[PDB]
């Protein structure tokens, strides 16, 4: 229906259309202000002239939150998975702490370059049972 | 004019009284309980 009636697109917004002609330049490109005037003119705006983002889950604004959410989660899972796998790899080499202080670059890089398939590796470790642990085998404190 | 309310000769005594009453007695009470002492 008329979702976000109090919000008008930047293409129709009054204060936004007033301010878009007078946008500053971020980089060295003098058109960058008018570039923003043309780029942000598609989003929904408020009566103040600033763009608003809707994150309720609708696909109309999947470029507002969905794409950065997925891109982050991908890169962050990459980071955490290569870190966890390298931490486990250290546990069998000489001195498990010294190699945590001094990085094994030929090993850390080898594990980083194999992180683009971290979801499949994680599911294969969960089905086999390598991802999680058992409560009866973890050091716990007195209750 | 200070007291537009009834019985304006009460707030006076009431303010001094609380001034030289409650904390005087309070500080003296702890003293008195310190007095029993105990020379063995």
């Amino acid at each position: 229906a008329d979702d976000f009636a109090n919000l008008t697109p930047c293409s129709e917004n009054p204060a936004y259309l007033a301010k878009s002609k007078n946008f500053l330049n971020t980089t060295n490109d003098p058109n960058s202000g008018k570039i923003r005037a043309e780029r942000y003119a598609s989003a929904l705006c408020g009566p103040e002239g600033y763009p608003h983002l809707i994150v309720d889950g609708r696909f109309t604004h999947a470029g507002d939150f969905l794409i950065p959410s997925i891109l982050f989660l991908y890169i962050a899972g990459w980071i955490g998975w290569v870190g966890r796998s390298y931490l486990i790899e250290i546990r069998e080499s000489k001195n498990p702490e010294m190699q945590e202080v001094v990085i094994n670059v030929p090993l850390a890089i080898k594990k980083m370059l194999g992180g683009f398939l971290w979801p499949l590796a994680a599911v294969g470790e969960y089905t086999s049972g390598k991802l999680v642990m058992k409560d009866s085998e973890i050091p716990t404190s007195p209750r | 004019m200070d007291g537009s309310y009834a019985a304006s000769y009460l707030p006076w005594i009431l303010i001094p009284m609380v001034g030289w009453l409650f904390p005087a007695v309070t500080m003296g009470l702890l003293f008195i309980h310190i007095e029993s002492e105990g020379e063995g």
Partner: protein, 40 residues
């Protein structure tokens, strides 16, 4: 010698090299394509 190859691969040197590299990536990306509040 390996004594310096181990120093260049220590925790602080590597954790600052990665931060410098990621800073370069982000700075150049927001140089060529700045002002990305969302995805078009």
């Amino acid at each position: 010698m390996d004594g310096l190859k181990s120093f260049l691969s220590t925790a602080p040197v590597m954790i600052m090299a990665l931060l410098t590299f990621t800073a370069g990536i982000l700075i150049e990306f927001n140089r060529f394509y700045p002002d990305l509040l969302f995805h078009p």
